[PDB]
UniProtKB/Swiss-Prot annotation, chain A:
Taxonomic placement: Bacteria, Pseudomonadati, Aquificota, Aquificia, Aquificales
Protein name from the UniProt record: Ribonuclease 3
Activity's dependence on pH: Optimum pH is 8-9.
UniProt subunit comment: Homodimer.
Entry binding sites for Mg(2+): 41, 108, 111
Residue numbers of the full-length protein present here: 1 to 147 of 221
Amino acid sequence: GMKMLEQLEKKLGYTFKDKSLLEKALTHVSYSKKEHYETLEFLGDALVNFFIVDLLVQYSPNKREGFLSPLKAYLISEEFFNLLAQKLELHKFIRIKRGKINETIIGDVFEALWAAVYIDSGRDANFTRELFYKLFKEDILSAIKEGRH
Amino acid sequence: GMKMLEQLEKKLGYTFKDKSLLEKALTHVSYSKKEHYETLEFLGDALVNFFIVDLLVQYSPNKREGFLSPLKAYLISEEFFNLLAQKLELHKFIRIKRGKINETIIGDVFEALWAAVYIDSGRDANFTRELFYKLFKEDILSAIKEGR
Ligand SMILES: [Mg+2]
Ligand SMILES: [Mg+2]
């Protein structure tokens, strides 16, 4: 009946001050050239990279870089990022032209989405960090015990 | 603390609650197989990459990723990390046995220092990022505008 252009803030557990910041992260070039998520994703690349290795360092049974690197590569692959986005029904809110979206846009939007939240929050790394954990902390650890990649 | 640490802190502009936390970041495995900077370096790598890209995203006059990546590549270079490490004469505090300090090792310790700052502060990314800007934002800015 309702919820089509949004409901994702209800998934995240975060309501944006600036809606066009959430929009932008969900907007691919083909749909909008003025403002799309390219610059947000670049930030979100490194922003999310820190959220994950900060967990890695803490919960991995090892500690040595040799056992952390192959595990790190996995937890920050588009593939895994998809499994994290699926929990967001991300594909649903992306604003993309034509019928070819793909798995590359997704994780990237997954990337631009946590950078938008970051920036929305007034550059609140901790909060945003914590918002990220409430959603996928569970899943990352799990992925840490089974040892994938 | 100790008869040395205390000065790394005044330069850094931050005093640790955990003294051995800062030491482990300065300690090469050659000096202590048990507690050495390797894991902190893991953290601080992602940590430092974050602070710097954040500044990049913010102050770059060109936003196109095709413009961003390059300067970034330098901003995380071990060359540039050494530029920043010089600001606290970090080689002076590094713990190492049989063998000499390098720029690489200095870059690895730079990373490890910031992860330890981050952890010792209560895993406070905001505070740590600001301490990082207080010290280095000015050099990163002059840098971004193709400052040799
Ligand atoms: Mg990406
Ligand atoms: Mg390193």
